[PDB]
Swiss-Prot record:
Induction: During stationary phase (at protein level). Also by cold stress, remains ribosome-associated for the 4 hours tested, then disappears when cells are warmed (at protein level). The gene is raiA. Belongs to the HPF/YfiA ribosome-associated protein family. YfiA subfamily. Associates mainly with 70S ribosomes. Localized at the surface of the 30S ribosomal subunit, at the interface with the 50S subunit. Binds across the channel in the 30S subunit where tRNAs and mRNA interact during protein biosynthesis. Can also associate with 100S ribosomes, which are inactive dimers of 70S ribosomes. Contacts modifed methylated residues of 16S rRNA (in complex with T.thermophilus ribosome, 2/3 residues are also modified in E.coli). The keyword Amino-acid biosynthesis does not apply. NCBIfam families: PRK10324.1, yfiA. GO terms for biological process: dormancy process; negative regulation of translational elongation; negative regulation of translational initiation; response to cold. This is Ribosome-associated inhibitor A. Residues 91-113 are annotated as: Disordered. It comes from Escherichia coli (strain K12). During stationary phase prevents 70S dimer formation, probably in order to regulate translation efficiency during transition between the exponential and the stationary phases. During environmental stress such as cold shock or excessive cell density at stationary phase, stabilizes the 70S ribosome against dissociation, inhibits translation elongation and increases translation accuracy. When normal growth conditions are restored, is quickly released from the ribosome. Has been suggested to inhibit translation elongation by blocking the A-site (aminoacyl-tRNA site). Disruption phenotype: Non-essential gene, increased formation of inactive 100S ribosomes in stationary phase, which persist longer than in wild-type. Double hpr-yfiA deletion mutants form 90S ribosomes. A quadruple yfiA-hpf-rmf-sra knockout strain is significantly outcompeted by wild-type after 4 days growth. No visible effect on viability or growth rate at 37 or 10 degrees Celsius, slight effect on bulk translation and timing of expression of some cold-shock proteins. GO terms for cellular component: cytosol; cytosolic small ribosomal subunit. Pfam families: Ribosomal_S30AE.
Length: 113
C-alpha cells in the first residue's frame, strides 16, 4: 500500500486527506493486498468524482463515488469498492454432498457451462 493520491484540479484538502487516509488505513487489512492504491479525488460540476483505482493481486478495484458532498464521495466510494471486493474474493462453494465430496477446492474455473 504505497497510498497514491493524485487529483486532477481539486487538490487534497486537510479534511478530505484525513477522510480517505483513515479509510485506506483500515482497508489495508481487507481480503485483498492493495499494492498500488491510486486514489483520484476530483471536483465535478454536478458532484465530486471519487476515482479510487487500487491494484489488487486479482486485478484492479475501482471505487467510483459521485456526489455533491466531498465527504459523501469518500464514503460512497468505499461502499461500492467493498461490495466489488467481496465478489472478487467469493470463492467458497464446491459441489459437496454425494460421492463427489472427496475433493478440495481444486479447479473451479472453466467447468462446463
Amino acid at each position: 500500500m504505497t497510498m497514491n493520491i493524485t487529483s486532477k484540479q481539486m487538490e487534497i484538502t486537510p479534511a478530505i486527506r484525513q477522510h480517505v487516509a483513515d479509510r485506506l488505513a483500515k482497508l489495508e487489512k481487507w481480503q485483498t493486498h492493495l499494492i498500488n492504491p491510486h486514489i483520484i479525488l476530483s471536483k465535478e460540476p454536478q458532484g465530486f468524482v471519487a476515482d479510487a483505482t487500487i491494484n489488487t493481486p486479482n486485478g484492479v478495484l475501482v471505487a467510483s463515488g459521485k456526489h455533491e458532498d466531498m465527504y459523501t464521495a469518500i464514503n460512497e466510494l468505499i461502499n461500492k469498492l467493498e461490495r466489488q471486493l467481496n465478489k472478487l474474493q467469493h470463492k467458497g462453494e464446491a459441489r459437496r454432498a454425494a460421492t463427489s465430496v472427496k475433493d478440495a477446492n481444486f479447479v473451479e474455473e472453466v467447468e462446463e457451462e
